Amino acid sequence: NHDKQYIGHAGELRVLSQRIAKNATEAAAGKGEAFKLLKDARNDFEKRWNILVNGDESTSLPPSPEAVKPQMDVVQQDWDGLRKNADSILASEQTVLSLHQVASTLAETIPQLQVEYEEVVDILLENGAPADQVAVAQRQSLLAERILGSVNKVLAGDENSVQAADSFGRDASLFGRVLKGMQEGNAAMSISKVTNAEAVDRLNEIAELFEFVSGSVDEILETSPDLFQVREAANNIFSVSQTLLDKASQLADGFENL
């Protein structure tokens, strides 16, 4: 029978749109499995949609008549928006992955960079130093923690993700400035050079650790707006799919009416 094919394939397009929305909102959170499950769901949706519009050769299903053209006229308008913004998500797979990976790397480097600075502070207290140097080392210890929190704020896909990315970049710039002003002798902001030897060795370790932070600033700055766009596209997919569920229900009930 042929009508059963139309009705069942519309009822399955329902679940297809639902799973497309679910996989999109999962992949927006940096889960590489949903990134491919979404492609599978999108391809299945396109297959069923094409065999509902053009007709299936395997089952010899005739093309849909003109009596369903008005209904079928709207679902495509809700699929054109679902498919395209889906491709975008796919087109930004690896990029969105890179962030979610490199952030997960920073999440382990910034703490040890931070606490090490703490032990620098203590050194400058157990060896004697002006209060300015101790306070500046404390400012660095807290700037590192703010950088870590900024990385966490970037992994949300919100309007504050790009703000926290630029904040991360500028805080890392300030961190490098103060770090090399403490390691060497500069005249920028009255940055006194550290005289202690153990403190200087720990600062060398801190600089070798901050290497991986000062190199990933450009990557995060260049890739975080793409993550925000992926999150916005996922929200759009969810809304348009919730509407397309009702549209396809109306389509299937119009099929059952005939």
From Swiss-Prot:
Query: What superkingdom does the record give?
Result: Bacteria
Q: Periplasmic face: residue ranges? A: 1-258
State its location(s): Cell inner membrane
The entry's function note states: May be a part of a signal-transduction system that regulates twitching motility by controlling pilus function (extension and retraction).
Q: Which family does it belong to?
A: Belongs to the methyl-accepting chemotaxis (MCP) protein family.
The protein's name: Protein PilJ
Species of origin reads Pseudomonas aeruginosa (strain ATCC 15692 / DSM 22644 / CIP 104116 / JCM 14847 / LMG 12228 / 1C / PRS 101 / PAO1)
Origin organism lineage: Bacteria, Pseudomonadati, Pseudomonadota, Gammaproteobacteria, Pseudomonadales
